C-alpha cells in the first residue's frame, strides 16, 4: 500500500456543512472504509496540522461535514508550544501524518476498525515529559459553492431541531444530535452521536460548539483514539463493547486493516503489462469503490455500494441496480465479499407475491433503495423509488462473481431471483408480446390517478394544462399542437433506459430539431409514442415506450445466455435448454430486425401500428442517428460475425465514433449530437468498455488496444490525483460529473486489466 | 360623431396572423361594432389605399388577422392606373376614406349592418368610363413581436388543417376554413367562412391565396359590398337573407348605424363642464367598450363584453364577472341594452340545483365563460373556468342599470340571481362561519384528487414533490423546510381576489422579503395559511384563505346593502330588513376588527387559531403594508365617519398614496412595493375611482376633484390617440397592459361623468 501515496487528493479544511463544488457535490474527498458512516480528510497546512480535519457524516442518505478541526493535537513543553513541520499522505486503506520537531515527533495513523468506528494511533516520541492538548469546533456555516458562501444561513438557523451539543464522558467526549427530517438535506434519528474514546485520562473544557482537552505524559508513548458515528440508539449501545475491544487490542485492528488492504491490491492488480501510471489508475478505482461501500443501514440489511459517497444525491446508502451490476462485476476481482453483498442488497427488495404496494410487479427490482422507505412503505424517505428499474446486466454480474469464486452455492442463491426478474420483464415490459422487451414504467402515484388514468401535462407557450387518460393523450399527440408534452411515466421510462437524454429516445433540442427538419426530416420522426401494459383481465401492469431498444434486447440475450449456464451448473437441463432457445430467438430478432444493411449499424425499432412481413415490430430508427446501443449486440455476443465486422468499421471511423476520446454516446453524424451533452456525445467509461469488449469478442482486440491507448493519452486527469468523474467531452477530453463516481471506477479498473498496457 | 375623428389610431397593415406587441396583444386597433366577429383597419398609406386592410377574425376565443390587403380597389383608365391622394379617418361607429384625383374621386364609408356583417359604400365620381380592379391576398407569416418575427413559421405550416381557400362566387367571393381546435391559438368549426357580396357583377380570378376581381363602369356609380365572418354552417345559412336585405336597402342600414351612434353619444356625453379633451376621453371609452361587445356565440347565449377584443387572452367572447360589473355600470349610461345583456351572460351560467358538475356550488358564478364549454361540460374549450369566481359588485352593477332605466322589471329579473350568489358566499366561503366571507376556491380537478384530497407541490432547490391531503399540507407548513409551496387551489384563490400578486395575499419577491426579515420581521409573516370548507355531512364545498379580506367584507356589505335597496323597490319590506341587518353586522365587524387606529388604515385580518377576545377572527395584518383594500370600506360605505377621516389623510399623503398618479395598488411604504409591479404599486383606474368615490361619500369631494385633475394631467397618453390600457406607474405615469381594456375604459368614463371638469 505504501507504493501508492496520495492517489487521490484527500486534503481539505471544510468551512461549511455543504462545502460543494459547482454541481453540488462535496468538494473534498474524505477517506471511508469498512462500510463506515463517517469519513476523514488530511490536513492541508499549519491550521489543521495535528489532526484529520473535515469529519464527514453520512446522515442516512446524505454527506454533511460536521467540523473542520476536531480533536486536533498540539504539543507543549515547559508551557511553550512545539513547532512542527508537516508531512501528510493517504495510502490505500489509511491516512497518515508525521509531525517533526527537534525534541518531539508524532506519527499518526488512521484506519477503520468496524463499520461504525475508525481508529487513530498517535505515536509520540519524546525524550522528556510533555503536555498534550486537543481542540475541536463544530461548523457554523451552512452552504458554499467552490469556496464561496451561497448565503449567510447557519446550520442551527436552518435546522433549529439539530440542537448539536458536545458533552464530556468518562473517557473522552461525544456530540449529540437532535432529530432532523430534512428529506433532501439532512436526516437524523434524534439518537445519533459522534463519539471520541481515548486510551488515557484527559481533561476537557467545553465552550458551546468548541472544546479543548488536556493530558500529561511522561515521555515516548503511543495513544489510541476511536471515532464513531452511530446513527441509532441501538447502534450506540452495540458499539460500546467493540470500542472497548479496540482500545484493549489496537494492534489487532491495525493489522486486520493492513492485511485486508494488502489483499485488495494483491487480488486486483492482475495486469503485468500495465505501466506504473496505469496501475495507479487501478488503485484509484479500488480506493473509490471501497470508499463508496456502505455497511447495512436502515431499510437496507446488506452491505451495498453507492454511485458516490461525496455526491449530492448519491450518498448515504442510496443504491441503484444499473450501478450495482457494474460495481459488483469489478469488485468480484478484489473485494468479492462486498460484490456479493451489493447484489444481495438490490435483490433484497425485489417485489414478492402479495406485495402491499405493487402486487402486479412480482420480480421487479426498485430503481432506488435507501435507509428510509417511501411513505407508501411506512417511512419518510423521499429518494426510495419504484417508478422504474434499470437495464439488466444482473446475470452478467452474478456470473462474474462465480467466475472468480467458483462458488456454486452463490449461483444457487441468486438463480431464482434472476429468474423472477427475467420473468417480470416479459410480463410487464413487452407491450406487443413478441418476447422482445421495451423500456417503460410502473403503475405509480406519480404516473396516474387513483383510478389508473395516465397523467400528462401539455405545454404551449406559457400555458400548462394537466390531463389524464390514454385516450386524451392519443388525441393530443395526433394534433401535435404543443411545444412539449410531459408524461411522468415516460420520464420514468427514460430513467429506466439509463440514458435519460439520449437521441434515440426522442431527445433533441430546438436548434438541432430545426436543422433536422431543414435537411428534409420531419419533427414527428423524433416523437416516441407511449402505451400502457394491461393483463388479460384489464389490470394495469405498467407502461412501455412503443419502441424496442437494441441494447435492451442485447442485455436480454445476455440474461438468457447466463441463466442457461447457471441452470446447467445447478443441474436443471430442461431450464437450460429453454434459456438457450430464448437467447437464440433474441439473437435472430436483433440481427434481422435491428441491423440496418445500408448504414451497417444497429438501431432501436419502433413498435409500429402493424408488424412487418418478417415479424419485426418495426423498422430500425436510422433517422435519429447512431449511438453506443449500436455495439450492444457485439458486447453481449448476439451479433453475427458479418454484422460485427460492419459495426466495427463504423466505430473506427473518425467521422463517426473514433474521436479524440473515442466511442462517445452519439456519433458525430447524429443530428442530435453535442460534444457536451451527457447522453448525446459525451464518452462514458461503461459504454466505452462495452465497445472495446464487443470489438475484442469478434476478433478486433488489436484495434481495441489502440483505442484504449488513445483513451489513456487523451482522457483528461487520468494520471492526475483528482477524483474519478462521470464522462468526457469526445473532442477535448474534458471531464464532468460527480467526483468519486463508482461505475466509472469499475470500468476504469476493467480497462486496466483488459486493455491498458505499456 | 363627426366631431370626434381618429379618437383611437385605427390604421395598420398587419403582416402576421399574430402581429403582436411586446405583451402578445394584437398591435393594431380594428373597428368592431354591433357585436360582430370581424373587424377592420384604416389604410396607412399608398400601399393600402383603396381598401380597409387588416381583416381581423374573432375565431371563437381569439383574434387573428386574415390578410393585409383584401378587396382593395384600384381604378384604371386606358390601361393606366389612376393616381389618387388619400384621406382616411375613423369616427365613432364608422371608417371613412376618400381617394382624390383630377377627374375621378372615390368616397368609401364602412359601418356595421348586423352582428355578423359590415357594409361598405363605394361612391365613384367620374367624367369618363373606368375599369375597376379589386385585389386581395391572405397572410402567410405566423407571428411577430413589434415587427420582429418570432420565427419563420407560416400559418399553413403551423396549422395544417386550417387549409384556407378562396373561391369565386356569382356576386363576389368567399374564404373557407378547415376545422382547427388549437385551444390556445385558433378555434374554428370547419364550417366558418368570410364572405364578400357586391351589388355589381365582377369577374374574379383566384391564384393560390390571392385574388383579382374586375368590372367596367360607364361613369359615376355607387356600389355596395358586404363583408361577413360566419362561424358555423347555421350562421352561414341565416346570414344570406340578411345580406339580401342589406343590399336592397343599403342607405337604410347606413342611417340606422349613424343614428344608433348619435344616441350613444347623446346619452353618454352629459358632463357640460368637461373640456374638449376630457370629452374625447369619454368618447374613446365609448368606442372601446362598444368594440369589445360581442353578440351571442357558442355556449354564451347573450350579448356580452370582454376585457379586450385585441387581447391575447381577452378576445372572442371570453367573459369574467369582475370586469362585467364595471363594464355594465359604465355602459348603463350609453348602451343600457348591452349592459343588461353583459350581466345576463354572466348569470346565465350561474350554478343551479342539481348541476351535473358541481351541485355543491348552487349560486356560484363562473370566473370565465366563453364560446367553448370545458370538457367537464361536454366541450373542448380550455378557457372556461370554474376553479373560482371574482369579487362581487354584482348588486352594485345591477343597481346602476336600474338607476338609469328606472325599469323595475329589470330589478325583479336579477334579484333572485343576486340572492342565490349572496347565499353561495355564506355557504362556501366562510370557513369559520362568522358571517364574514373569505376569498377562496372551488372543488376542482385542478385542486384535488378524485377522493377529494387537496393537491400541492413542495419545492426545495431543484427538487419538486407533489403531495395531497390537508393533513400533509399542515405538516409541511409547520416544518417550513422548503423554498416554495405551490397549491393550485390557493392560486385560484388569488384569482378570485382579483389581485393575483398583491402584498396582502403573501406575494413578495426574495429581495424584498430578505430585506423585511433583515429589518426584524419574520418570513412567516408573509405566509397565508389555507383551509378546506366542508358541510355538516363532510362534503367538500371548496376552500378558503385563512384570512378575511377587508375589501371582500366591504363588497359583502355592498351586496347586502344593495339587496336591501332592491327588496324595498320590489316591495319586500321583511327581506329588506334582513339584508339591512346583515349589512350592519358586516360594517360593525369591518370597523371593529379591520381598522387600525395606530396607522389610521384598514387591513385584512388573519383567521387566527383562535378568535380574539372581542370576537374578531384575528388582528389586522398591518405588517404587510397598506393597499387599496384600505379604502374599500369607504367606497362601499361601511366605514364610520371618523375612520373615513383617518383613511383619507393617509390617501392624501404624498409619502403613502398621493403619488404622481395617485392611489396605486400599494403604498410607497409597503414592504413589497414596486413601482412597476401590477398589484404592488401600479395604479388601476377602478381602484383609483373607488378611492375618489369613497372620499366623496365621506365629505371630501373637493379633494377627490383635485386628485381627478392630477390624474388627468399626469396619466401618460390620456389625451393622445393610443388605445386604453390597464395600469400606470405611480411615479412616472407610464402605461402597461392590454390595449383596448374594457374596465379601464369603464372607469375613465365614470371619471368623466363624476370628477373631470374644466
Ligand atoms: Ca416487445
Ligand atoms: Ca369568515
Curated annotation (Swiss-Prot), chains A, B:
One of its GO terms (biological process) is DNA damage response. It holds the Pfam family MGH1-like_GH. Ca(2+) binds at residues 430, 432, 434, 436, 438, 548. Its EC number is 3.2.1.-. Residues 230-275 are annotated as: Linker. Keywords: Calcium, Glycosidase, Hydrolase, Metal-binding, Signal. The active site is at 500 (proton donor), 726 (proton acceptor). One of its GO terms (cellular component) is glucosidase complex. The keyword Nucleotide-binding does not apply. Residues 1-230 are annotated as: N-terminal domain. One of its GO terms (molecular function) is glucosidase activity. The keyword Transferase does not apply. Residues 276-758 are annotated as: A domain. InterPro entries: 6-hairpin_glycosidase_sf, 6hp_glycosidase-like_sf, Glyco_hydro_37, MGH1-like_GH, YgjK_N. Glucoside hydrolase that cleaves the alpha-1,3-glucosidic linkage in nigerose. Has very low activity towards maltooligosaccharides, soluble starch, nigerotriose, kojibiose and trehalose. Belongs to the glycosyl hydrolase 63 family. PANTHER family: TREHALASE. This is Glucosidase YgjK. It comes from Escherichia coli (strain K12).
Amino acid at each position: 500500500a505504501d507504493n501508492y501515496k496520495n492517489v487521490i487528493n484527500r486534503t481539505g479544511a471544510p468551512q461549511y456543512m455543504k462545502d460543494y463544488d459547482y454541481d453540488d457535490h462535496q468538494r473534498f474527498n474524505p477517506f471511508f472504509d469498512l462500510g463506515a458512516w463517517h469519513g476523514h480528510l488530511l490536513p492541508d497546512g499549519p491550521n489543521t496540522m495535528g489532526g484529520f480535519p473535515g469529519v464527514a457524516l453520512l446522515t442516512e442518505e446524505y454527506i454533511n461535514f460536521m467540523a473542520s478541526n476536531f480533536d486536533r493535537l498540539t504539543v507543549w513543553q515547559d508551557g511553550k508550544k512545539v513547532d512542527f513541520t508537516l508531512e501528510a499522505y493517504s495510502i490505500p486503506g489509511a491516512l497518515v501524518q508525521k509531525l517533526t520537531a527537534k525534541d518531539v515527533q508524532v506519527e499518526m495513523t488512521l484506519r477503520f476498525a468496524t463499520p461504525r468506528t475508525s481508529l487513530l494511533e498517535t505515536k509520540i516520541t519524546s525524550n522528556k515529559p510533555l503536555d498534550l492538548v486537543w481542540d475541536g469546533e463544530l461548523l457554523e456555516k451552512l452552504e458554499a459553492k467552490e469556496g464561496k458562501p451561497l448565503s449567510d444561513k447557519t446550520i442551527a438557523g436552518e435546522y433549529p431541531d439539530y440542537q448539536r451539543k458536545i458533552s464530556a464522558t468518562r473517557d473522552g467526549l461525544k456530540v449529540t444530535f437532535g432529530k432532523v427530517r430534512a428529506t433532501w438535506d439532512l436526516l437524523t434519528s434524534g439518537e445519533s452521536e459522534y463519539q471520541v474514546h481515548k486510551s488515557l485520562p484527559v481533561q476537557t473544557e467545553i465552550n458551546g460548539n468548541r472544546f479543548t482537552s488536556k493530558a500529561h505524559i511522561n515521555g515516548s508513548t503511543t495513544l489510541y483514539t476511536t471515532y464513531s458515528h452511530l446513527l441509532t440508539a441501538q447502534e450506540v449501545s452495540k458499539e460500546q463493547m467493540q470500542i472497548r475491544d479496540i482500545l484493549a487490542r489496537p494492534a489487532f485492528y491495525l493489522t486486520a486493516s493492513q492485511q485486508r488492504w494488502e489483499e485488495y491490491l494483491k487480488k486486483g492488480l492482475t495486469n503485468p503489462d500495465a505501466t506504473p501510471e496505469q496501475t495507479r489508475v487501478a488503485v484509484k478505482a479500488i480506493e473509490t469503490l471501497n470508499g463508496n461501500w456502505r455497511s447495512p443501514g436502515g431499510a437496507v440489511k446488506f452491505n451495498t455500494v453507492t454511485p458516490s459517497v461525496t455526491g449530492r444525491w448519491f450518498s448515504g446508502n442510496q443504491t441503484w441496480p444499473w450501478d450495482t451490476w457494474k460495481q459488483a462485476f469489478a469488485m468480484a476481482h478484489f473485494n468479492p465479499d462486498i460484490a456479493k453483498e451489493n447484489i444481495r442488497a438490490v435483490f433484497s427488495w425485489q417485489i414478492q407475491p402479495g406485495d402491499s404496494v405493487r402486487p402486479q410487479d412480482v420480480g421487479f427490482v426498485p430503481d432506488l433503495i435507501a435507509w428510509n422507505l417511501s411513505p407508501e412503505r411506512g417511512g419518510d424517505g423521499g429518494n426510495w423509488n419504484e417508478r422504474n428499474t434499470k437495464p439488466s446486466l444482473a446475470a452478467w454480474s452474478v456470473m462474474e462473481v462465480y467466475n472468480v469464486t467458483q462458488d456454486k452455492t452463490w449461483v444457487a442463491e441468486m438463480y431464482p431471483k434472476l429468474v423472477a426478474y427475467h420473468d417480470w420483464w416479459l410480463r410487464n415490459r413487452d407491450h406487443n408480446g413478441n418476447g422482445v422487451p421495451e423500456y417503460g414504467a410502473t403503475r405509480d402515484k406519480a404516473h396516474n390517478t387513483e383510478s389508473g388514468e395516465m397523467l400528462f401535462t401539455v405545454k404551449k407557450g406559457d400555458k400548462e394544462e394537466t390531463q389524464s387518460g390514454l385516450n386524451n393523450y392519443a388525441r393530443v399527440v395526433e394534433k401535435g399542437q404543443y411545444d412539449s408534452l410531459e408524461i411522468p411515466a415516460q420520464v420514468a421510462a427514460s430513467w429506466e433506459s439509463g440514458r435519460d437524454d439520449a437521441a434515440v429516445f426522442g431527445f433533441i433540442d430546438k436548434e438541432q430539431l430545426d436543422k433536422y427538419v431543414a435537411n428534409g426530416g420531419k419533427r414527428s420522426d423524433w416523437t416516441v409514442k407511449f402505451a400502457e401494459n394491461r393483463s388479460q383481465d384489464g389490470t394495469l401492469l405498467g407502461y412501455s415506450l412503443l419502441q424496442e431498444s437494441v441494447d435492451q434486447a442485447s442485455y436480454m440475450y445476455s440474461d438468457n445466455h447466463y441463466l442457461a449456464e447457471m441452470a446447467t451448473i445447478l443441474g436443471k437441463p430442461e431450464e437450460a435448454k429453454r434459456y438457450r432457445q430464448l437467447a437464440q430467438q433474441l439473437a435472430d430478432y436483433i440481427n434481422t430486425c435491428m441491423f440496418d444493411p445500408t448504414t451497417q449499424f444497429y438501431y432501436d425499432v419502433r413498435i409500429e401500428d402493424k408488424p412487418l412481413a418478417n415479424g419485426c415490430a418495426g423498422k430500425p430508427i436510422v433517422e435519429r442517428g447512431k449511438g453506443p446501443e449500436g455495439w450492444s449486440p457485439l458486447f453481449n455476443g448476439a451479433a453475427t460475425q458479418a454484422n460485427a465486422d460492419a459495426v466495427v468499421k463504423v466505430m473506427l471511423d473518425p467521422k463517426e465514433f473514433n474521436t479524440f476520446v473515442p466511442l462517445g454516446t452519439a456519433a458525430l453524424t447524429n443530428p442530435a449530437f453535442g460534444a457536451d451533452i451527457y447522453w448525446r456525445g459525451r464518452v462514458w467509461v461503461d459504454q466505452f468498455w462495452f465497445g472495446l469488449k464487443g470489438m475484442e469478442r469478434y476478433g478486433y482486440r488489436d484495434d481495441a488496444l489502440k483505442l484504449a491507448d488513445t483513451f489513456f493519452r487523451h482522457a483528461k486527469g487520468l494520471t492526475a490525483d483528482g477524483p474519478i468523474q462521470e464522462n468526457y467531452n469526445p473532442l477535448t477530453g474534458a471531464q464532468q460529473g460527480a467526483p468519486n463516481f463508482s461505475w466509472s471506477a469499475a470500468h476504469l479498473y476493467m480497462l486496466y486489466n483488459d486493455f491498458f498496457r505499456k
